[PDB]
Amino acid sequence: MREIVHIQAGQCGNQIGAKFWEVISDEHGIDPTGTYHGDSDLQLDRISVYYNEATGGKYVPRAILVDLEPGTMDSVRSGPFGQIFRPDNFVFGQSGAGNNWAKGHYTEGAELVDSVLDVVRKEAESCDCLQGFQLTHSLGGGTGSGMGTLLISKIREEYPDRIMNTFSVVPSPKVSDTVVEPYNATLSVHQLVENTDETYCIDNEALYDICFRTLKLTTPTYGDLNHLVSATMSGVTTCLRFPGQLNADLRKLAVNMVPFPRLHFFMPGFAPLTSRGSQQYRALTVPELTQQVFDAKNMMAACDPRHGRYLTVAAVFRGRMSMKEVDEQMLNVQNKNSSYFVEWIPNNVKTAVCDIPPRGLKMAVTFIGNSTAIQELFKRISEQFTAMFRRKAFLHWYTGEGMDEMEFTEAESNMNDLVSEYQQYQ
Amino acid sequence: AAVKTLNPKAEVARAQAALAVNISAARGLQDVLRTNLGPKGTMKMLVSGAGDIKLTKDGNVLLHEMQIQHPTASLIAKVATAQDDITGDGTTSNVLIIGELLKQADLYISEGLHPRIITEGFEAAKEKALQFLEEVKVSREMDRETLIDVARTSLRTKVHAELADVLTEAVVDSILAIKKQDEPIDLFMIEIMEMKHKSETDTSLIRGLVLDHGARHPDMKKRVEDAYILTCNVSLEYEKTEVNSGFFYKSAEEREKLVKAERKFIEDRVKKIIELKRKVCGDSDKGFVVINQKGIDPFSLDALSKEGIVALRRAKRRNMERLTLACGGVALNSFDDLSPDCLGHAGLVYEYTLGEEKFTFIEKCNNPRSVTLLIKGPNKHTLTQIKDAVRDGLRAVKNAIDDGCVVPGAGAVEVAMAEALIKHKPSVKGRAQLGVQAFADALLIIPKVLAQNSGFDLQETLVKIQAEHSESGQLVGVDLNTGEPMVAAEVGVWDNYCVKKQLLHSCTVIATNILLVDEIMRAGM
Amino acid sequence: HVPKAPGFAQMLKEGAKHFSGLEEAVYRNIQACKELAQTTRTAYGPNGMNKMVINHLEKLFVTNDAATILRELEVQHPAAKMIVMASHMQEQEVGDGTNFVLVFAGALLELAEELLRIGLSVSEVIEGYEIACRKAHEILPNLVCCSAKNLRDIDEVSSLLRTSIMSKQYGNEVFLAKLIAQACVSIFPDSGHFNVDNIRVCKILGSGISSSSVLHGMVFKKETEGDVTSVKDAKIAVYSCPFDGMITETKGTVLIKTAEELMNFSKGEENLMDAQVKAIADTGANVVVTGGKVADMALHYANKYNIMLVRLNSKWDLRRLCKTVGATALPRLTPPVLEEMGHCDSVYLSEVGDTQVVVFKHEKEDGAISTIVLRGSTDNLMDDIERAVDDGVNTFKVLTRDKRLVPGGGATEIELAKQITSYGETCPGLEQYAIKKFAEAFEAIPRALAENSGVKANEVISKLYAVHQEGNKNVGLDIEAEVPAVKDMLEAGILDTYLGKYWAIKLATNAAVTVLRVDQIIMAKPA
Amino acid sequence: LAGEMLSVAEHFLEQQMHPTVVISAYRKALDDMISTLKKISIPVDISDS
Ligand SMILES: Nc1ncnc2c1ncn2[C@@H]1O[C@H](COP(=O)(O)OP(=O)(O)O)[C@@H](O)[C@H]1O
Ligand SMILES: Nc1ncnc2c1ncn2[C@@H]1O[C@H](COP(=O)(O)OP(=O)(O)O)[C@@H](O)[C@H]1O
Ligand SMILES: [Mg+2]
């Protein structure tokens, strides 16, 4: 049981979602045209969670690809293993969003989202017990903010009680693509703290310095960008896709990640980060990988964990190792660096492990946890939102589609309330 | 130019330059879309970037799925979007009027005149064209034989006249048994399902509903006669509390007591269903079908299968609206007031599997007021031909029921309207004398395109049609078989009143605004 | 110096192409579908040749059936996909005759180019083909000579299934007809709905085709994890839950407050699992098949009370086992089973072809399900016989729906070529040319049978009209040797799928008409 | 004319006929087209203006 339907909505969601199934099909040994190539119940038991078994042995991924562009999703049509999905899981959009939040909701969203909900209904027929949904999108995209915010609200009319695990690609504080990026980031999050429970923060432009300095890449691109993001996506859904002693599904992850439901912005990441030549000349031990996730060199967002304080720490390891050394190593950091941890939690760092090795790396750990690192990033978004709205610059692009001046006022009051929500325990 | 000085990367078009951009682009959309107007039009195969075939010739699907990047083509595509949104047909004829309102006006603006003088003649010609349209409409009290000829005209122009005899019986008989006593007919009560069973000429009209999901348990009955429909909105699957609670137990004997107790609230919903089957005199067959919009766990599916209750799951939003009218029950959201008054009735509930995909059929209702057109096209692209023609035909008969009058057919409206503007051409008494002439010649493209697609002559046909109209009083039209002028009101070729009314209003305003554009430019970078 | 030609009226494409007219759109769709007709012309008939087709995944597909060839070829022409999807609908409807659609509709469009370039346009070729297509469905009930009604047993259906086997497996036409007769008749629903899903093929690598057999039951490819592999009573209890205990669904947490609750928790868990395994040992069960995982304590008491465990990780294989032994999959943990038990005759294990299998062999009550165990030297040979086996199963479903048969091997297409030509000569109109070309499309179908046999098809097609003098209606082709001297088809026993011939003419005519309706092509920029 | 004589020659190449048989039939047809034009000809008076 506990089936999860995946919804890859947006331009940036399909680029991550193309390599998201490349890791699952390689670790489980699922043949794209055969039946399976597994070995035991570590890989063959959890096939029915993320795949629906057809008659004959062919496995179909529970994935819905939504995009308001024909040319973007054609790479996932007949490209890098994109012919394995259902033909009705390829909902195209002939009208582009144009990096506008108001166009994807009132113009494009009024005619497409009734058909996108039909694809979730057909996927839920093969789900004997629906656990929840995931949503990979972006804040600086038109379809990621248009078909990601309106899709997450209409899915609660049919699924009001099920959990949600959204994946949000945050914009970068270093470079900018357009001036409406503080507009699209403020409007998408303002309806995201309303009735959701999980949201990560991944910065793509911040990973260009990680590939240049650590992964030893001279000229990075979008193909080298999404490789280590897929390692972070597979690290969260490790115990969900592989059985083990530390059983923790998405239902157990929704409770033990947030003491409060509103402050649900996490900082994903993983470890280690080795290049293509210096990987074999490095040994990986238990205190080596456990002490690398706390530093600033293993962050997926442009943040600084050296000036913050965490609330809940969860880590999933890869490989048969002694997990009693993880708790004893992290407890010694909580006594000497108690200003970075919680004072009333005796076991801040949670433990998770599996018996399936990853691709390429021998041992690997991932970092899932919230802190005050999102608080300093939410101030820069509201700072750019304040200067643009006070001059009322480019408001006719939004108010001409169905918005108003009071819509941005309520979107500014509650987003600055989230800044004071993180400012209490800082 | 002034825009080149401020922004060096900003293109511009001047007064005599921007007029040639909009007119030559309107001729580009006119010369493409004129090959599909009427029954003698040709099919267009539209291939996207993926490689799928979209074989259709409707004017709205042609303009949207066309690789064109032009600002003039985006204005006509938005007017063509609203023509296929509120009234169905009238999209191909929409673009051909705009293609002639800018081409006939170019003969005067380039010959010294101002574009505003032509737009003043379009408003004076629209006032006479609106008054003449109310004099040619025929009220026939919405007879069921009249609606056949209305649906036959809209269906022939999208199929090869072998399926038009089949789809007319599936469109007219579907639109009559929805609403009565002067009620607006809701088109959401008709379900359109795509099948692959027999052939394209096998689309039938199911009197009830066809659900695209089947039973999710192998022990359930596949064919159920004399069933009771119990429409539910509750969630029979396992749900947790909103507050994160979890369990705490001491021994292993108390572990199995918590699994039995956590399903007690789930089984209390199932016990309300199996006790309703015992209160409807279950000493017979007495089939029970639960559609159940929200999901059901396999624990409750195993409990309902032992009693003999077919239980579906994951229904649509409008399935609780169409089946509620068809079965006559009450779509409940709780099991606190279960009664036989909220139950439905169907004479036959059966399923059928088409390539590991079940389809639940519900038939034999008394007064359903909700039907389903079962399209069984062989290919994937042939399903898009019938679905785009059914909604073109359903919106045609919906306008003929709401409006009390019927408008005549092919050339019985456009030729008679153009002759009425010639006798009222000296009535303007000013410089706008040539504006009524440009509007009257633009309305004559509908007999010109229909005479061109049928293979006949263009100018020789329009002489004989205008001769029979000037020497008689009957609204004569175009015959696409012989070329002789034939009356459209007698041969059974009709049209909608709201289509011809909006063709005189949406095309005229979008032509007077395009002719008053002289500064096409691209700035903002 | 050198000038050039720019755009004229509507060149607004950003990298896309546009086709209009008879030469740029209609004639190019004909020449593209003509190459697909010449592609599968060699693989048509009993003397057809195989094709090693490598798809994008670099794996080998060798077969002579035209249905699985088009699924691996990545065709990008749009009108060529209309004749591929029409052949795919022949596989979904009747399961046989997919090569007939590529030959007949490939000859319809080829003779359509000989009519548009000689005379009348597509307004009369489409109307001329639909007149002859409706008359082609009237001769097919008049050409039925035999019926698959009398003595529906394993002896009579062995000869009726030879035609679907010998067209793809010519040398193995006798042994595969007996294996498809002992499997299709044994799963008969006693005058009900015949299901083709109740016949499975277990590919076992090993010796040749002479070691293949059909076992009444199911054969899996898994292990036991025990020592109870010899079971003769065979009382099967099927479970869909994982056979490891009963845990909750919300969180799961053991709470200990004193030393009495910690020490007795380990012994209390073992006594709880012992009472559940012994609850099925008192009911007389021998085989317990689960769907999920199995804990170590469940294997301790399974070997103690001597019951065999079967692990089925697939959930569609678990539903087929319930239709095999006649059991019900229980979603709950082990109850006292009242009447939902399974009943087989012999459940054992054996290593065949260095592959340890689990066989649910039914000795006496043989007919509940059938499994054809195929033996082949290569893995590619076992896929080609499985395609020939599944065409034999789909032929048995055709005879269930309609028991009529027509004489194949070329005897039906010549009589269809003679009667349509009689309708073409008596047609007082200009559309009679497309009716006579519709009968010549039936002439090319035994022409492909003679070219694959190495015989000159001009002398072959001349003897067919010479022996069809208004009363024979049965002589087809004798392709066993050169210098044909062709004989009767009812005496040789070559007759198959009248309902397969009914849908193949209807689908190939509608495929050729759909191409001829396309007059203007607007494609997009491919990615 | 050469495009049409090759158009009908492509039909016989699909009938498993050798190209030397079609050419030997083309040379027999070529010798009869010359003799037919000389029978349907008409003498011209070249002195007439
Ligand atoms: N049977 C017929 N005989 C003559 N004219 C017809 C016939 N059917 C349709 N037409 C004409 O074809 C024109 C276009 O029809 P259609 O294609 O359905 O609408 P649109 O062109 O707006 O999409 C109509 O104006 C009508 O007069
Ligand atoms: N013993 C035989 N003698 C002569 N012809 C045969 C014999 N067996 C099969 N054939 C011919 O071989 C052809 C095989 O066609 P096939 O490729 O099976 O069609 P489809 O692809 O529709 O299944 C048949 O049309 C039949 O006439
Ligand atoms: Mg065959």
Residue C375 Rama label (left phi>0; alpha psi -120 to 50; beta):
beta
Chains B and D touch (3+ CB pairs under 8 A): no
- Give the residue numbers spanning the domain of C363: 217-401
What's the angle, vertex CA A43, arms to CA A37 and CA A47, rounded to 5? Answer: 90
Q: Atom 12 (ligand 1): residue with closest C-alpha?
A: B38
CA distances from B292 to B236, B320, C345 (A): 8, 9, 41
Which residues 313-332 of C have a C-beta within 8 angstroms of B?
319, 322, 328, 330-332
- Cβ–Cβ < 8 Å for C183, C390: no
- Cβ–Cβ < 8 Å for A70, A11: no
- Return phi, psi of residue B368, to 5°: -75, -45
Kindly provide the b/e burial profile for residues A369-391, where b requires at least 16 CB atoms within 10 angstroms of the residue's own CB. bbbbbbbbbbeebbebbeebbee
Distance (Å, rounded) from C-alpha A273 to C-alpha A228? Answer: 9
Distance (Å, rounded) from C-alpha C64 to C-alpha C42? Answer: 9
Contact between C331 and B298 using a beta-carbon 8 Å cutoff: yes
Distance (Å, rounded) from C-alpha B448 to C-alpha C202? Answer: 67
Class of domain A266-374: alpha beta
Smallest Cα–Cα separation from C408: which of C446, C451, C455, C456? C446
CA of C479 to the centre of ligand 2 (A): 11
Q: Atom 4 (ligand 1): residue with closest C-alpha?
A: B410
**B485 touches ligand 1 (CB under 6 Å):** no
Domain ranges of chain A: 3-256, 266-374, 375-423
Distance (Å, rounded) from C-alpha C261 to C-alpha B251? Answer: 7
- Cβ–Cβ < 8 Å for B326, B317: no
Q: Atom 5 (ligand 2): residue with closest C-alpha?
A: C409
Distance (Å, rounded) from C-alpha B217 to C-alpha C329? Answer: 10
Smallest Cα–Cα separation from B72: which of B94, B92, B106, B98? B98
CA of C161 to the centre of ligand 3 (A): 10
Within 10 Å of residue A299's Cβ, how many Cβ atoms?
Answer: 22
- D16–C contact, CB cutoff 8 A: yes
Query: DSSP secondary structure string, A213-234?
Result: HTS--SS--HHHHHHHHHHHHH
Distance (Å, rounded) from C-alpha C79 to C-alpha C81? Answer: 5
The enclosing H or E element of C420 equals helix C411-425
- D6–C contact, CB cutoff 8 A: no
The residues of B annotated with a catalytic role in the active site are 58, 91-92, 392
What are chain D's partners, defined as 3 or more CB pairs within 8 angstroms?
C
Order of strands, sheet of B43-47, starting from the edge strand that comes earlier in the sequence: B53-56, B43-47, C518-523, C18-20
Q: Which residues line ligand 2 (CB under 6 A)?
A: C 44-46, 66, 96-100, 163, 166-167, 408-410, 449, 476-477, 479, 494, 504
Distance (Å, rounded) from C-alpha C460 to C-alpha C410? Answer: 11
Using a 10 angstrom Cβ sphere, with 0-12 exposed, 13-18 middle and 19 or more buried, the burial of residue A335 is: exposed
Using a 10 angstrom Cβ sphere, with 0-12 exposed, 13-18 middle and 19 or more buried, the burial of residue C374 is: buried
* Residue A260, amino acid: F
Counting other chains too, the contacts that C440-444 makes at CB distance below 8 Å and 24 or more residues apart are C440/C107, C440/C111, C441/C104, C441/C107, C441/C108, C441/C111, C442/C104, C442/C413, C442/C414, C442/C416, C442/C417, C443/C413, C443/C414, C443/C417, C444/C103, C444/C107
Contact between B235 and A74 using a beta-carbon 8 Å cutoff: no
B37, B399, B449, B500, best to mutate for ligand 1 pocket (most atoms within 8 Å of CB): B37
* Residue A273, amino acid: L
The enclosing H or E element of A64 equals strand A63-66
- Helix B380-402 to helix B164-176 angle (10° resolution) is 50
What's the angle, vertex CA B11, arms to CA B5 and CA B15, rounded to 5? Answer: 90
Which residues 181-240 of B have a C-beta within 8 angstroms of C?
196, 199-200, 218-219, 238, 240
**B410 touches ligand 1 (CB under 6 Å):** yes
Query: DSSP secondary structure string, B483-511?
Result: -S-EEHHHHT-EE-HHHHHHHTTHHHHHH
What are chain B's partners, defined as 3 or more CB pairs within 8 angstroms?
A, C
Residue B429 Rama label (left phi>0; alpha psi -120 to 50; beta):
left
Residue of B nearest to A120 (CA): B314
- Cβ–Cβ < 8 Å for B381, B61: no
**B59 touches ligand 1 (CB under 6 Å):** yes
**B30 touches ligand 1 (CB under 6 Å):** no
Q: Find which of C458, C460, C461 to mutate to test the D interface (most D CBs within 10 Å of its CB).
A: C458
Contact between C525 and B302 using a beta-carbon 8 Å cutoff: no
- Cβ–Cβ < 8 Å for A78, A100: no
Task: Please say whether the dihedral angle defined by the alpha carbons of residues C419, C425, C426 and C431, taken in this order, is positive or negative.
Answer: positive
CA of C168 to the centre of ligand 3 (A): 6
CA distances from C168 to C193, C381, C387 (A): 27, 12, 9
- CATH at C312: 3.50.7.10
Query: DSSP secondary structure string, B392-417?
Result: HHHHHHHHHHHSS-BEE-SSTTHHHH
Smallest Cα–Cα separation from C456: which of D14, A162, B311? D14
**Three-state secondary structure call for residue B53:** strand
Distance (Å, rounded) from C-alpha C29 to C-alpha B53? Answer: 14
Residues of A in contact with B49 (CB under 8 A): 70-71, 74
Alpha helix stretches (DSSP H) within A297-366: 324-336
Q: Which of B28, B48, B238 sits opposite C249 (nearest CB)?
A: B238
**Three-state secondary structure call for residue B144:** coil
Distance (Å, rounded) from C-alpha B191 to C-alpha B371? Answer: 7
- Return phi, psi of residue A74, to 5°: -75, -20
Kindly provide the b/e burial profile for residues A214-245, where b requires at least 16 CB atoms within 10 angstroms of the residue's own CB. bbebeeeeeeebbebbbbbbbbbbbbbbbbbe
Q: Atom 22 (ligand 1): residue with closest C-alpha?
A: B90
**B80 touches ligand 1 (CB under 6 Å):** no
Distance (Å, rounded) from C-alpha B222 to C-alpha B352? Answer: 8
| Domain covering A3-256: architecture | 3-Layer(aba) Sandwich (3.40)
* Residue A113, amino acid: V
- Return phi, psi of residue B72, to 5°: -75, -35
CA of C45 to the centre of ligand 3 (A): 7
- C24–B contact, CB cutoff 8 A: no
Tokens representing A418?
Answer: 């989230």
Those residues of chain C whose CB sits closer than 8 Å to some CB in chain A are 57, 59, 74, 197, 242, 249-252, 292-293, 311, 313-316, 524-527
* Residue C103, amino acid: V
User: Can you tell me which atom of ligand 2 is nearest the CA of C163?
Assistant: 8
Dihedral, A333, A335, A337, A338 alpha carbons, nearest 10: 130
Distance (Å, rounded) from C-alpha A256 to C-alpha A254? Answer: 6
E strands, B48-109, in order: 53-56
Full 3-state SS string of B452-467:
HHCCCCCHHHHHHHHH
List CB contacts of C339: < 8 A, sequence separation 6 or more. Answer: none
Q: How many CA atoms lie within 13 A of C407 on its CB side?
A: 23
List CB contacts of C134: < 8 A, sequence separation 6 or more. Answer: none
Dihedral, B135, B137, B142, B147 alpha carbons, nearest 10: 170
Q: Do domains A3-256 and A375-423 have the same CATH topology?
A: no
Please state which CATH number belongs to domain A375-423: 1.10.287.600
Using a 10 angstrom Cβ sphere, with 0-12 exposed, 13-18 middle and 19 or more buried, the burial of residue C3 is: exposed
What's the angle, vertex CA A166, arms to CA A165 and CA A168, rounded to 5? Answer: 150
Contact between A92 and B50 using a beta-carbon 8 Å cutoff: yes
What does this entry list as its resolution, in Å?
3.1
User: Can you tell me which atom of ligand 2 is nearest the CA of C90?
Assistant: 22
